[PDB]
From Swiss-Prot:
Annotated family: Belongs to the profilin family.
Organism, as annotated: Artemisia vulgaris (Mugwort)
Name this polypeptide is given: Profilin-1
SUPFAM superfamilies: Profilin (actin-binding protein) (SSF55770)
Any Gene Ontology CC annotation: cell cortex
Job description of the protein: Binds to actin and affects the structure of the cytoskeleton. At high concentrations, profilin prevents the polymerization of actin, whereas it enhances it at low concentrations. By binding to PIP2, it inhibits the formation of IP3 and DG. Possesses high binding affinity for poly(L-proline).
Length: 136
């Protein structure tokens, strides 16, 4: 028994096997809307505050990141179609990133083949909607 852990949602809802494919996200994390990390998986990249701030900016006003690309841990993802104030998506070859904004949080998923883009989107959006339903 403990008082709870954001790591529980990272391991059990983001890093779990996806729909009986036997495949999972490479890494995942939950951040506060201010850019503080609440929990991140064992392989999540070495992100730096400027990268998170750039992502916060993009949620506040879409179309800022795409001319430059999305940096996280030094790696460059090309920005693809998202949803203003809700979802930011990035591509790097057959991998990518998906970020879902909630009231109080941002949920990150990073994937590589054979995980499809839609599956990252699905995993991160399902957790984000659950947090939204709880007023977070």
């Amino acid at each position: 028994s403990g008082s709870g852990s954001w790591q529980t949602y990272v391991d059990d809802h983001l890093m779990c096997d996806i729909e009986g494919t036997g495949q999972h996200l490479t890494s995942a994390a939950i951040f506060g809307t201010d850019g503080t990390v609440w929990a991140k998986s064992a392989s999540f990249p070495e992100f730096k505050p400027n990268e998170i701030d750039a992502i916060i900016k993009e949620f506040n006003e879409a179309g800022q990141l795409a001319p430059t690309g999305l940096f996280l841990g030094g790696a460059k993802y090309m920005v693809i179609q998202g949803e203003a104030g809700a979802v930011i998506r990035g591509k790097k070859g057959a991998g990518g990133i998906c970020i879902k904004k909630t009231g109080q949080a941002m949920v990150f998923g990073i994937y590589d083949e054979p995980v499809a883009p839609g599956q990252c989107n699905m995993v991160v959006e399902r957790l984000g909607d659950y947090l939204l339903d709880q007023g977070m």
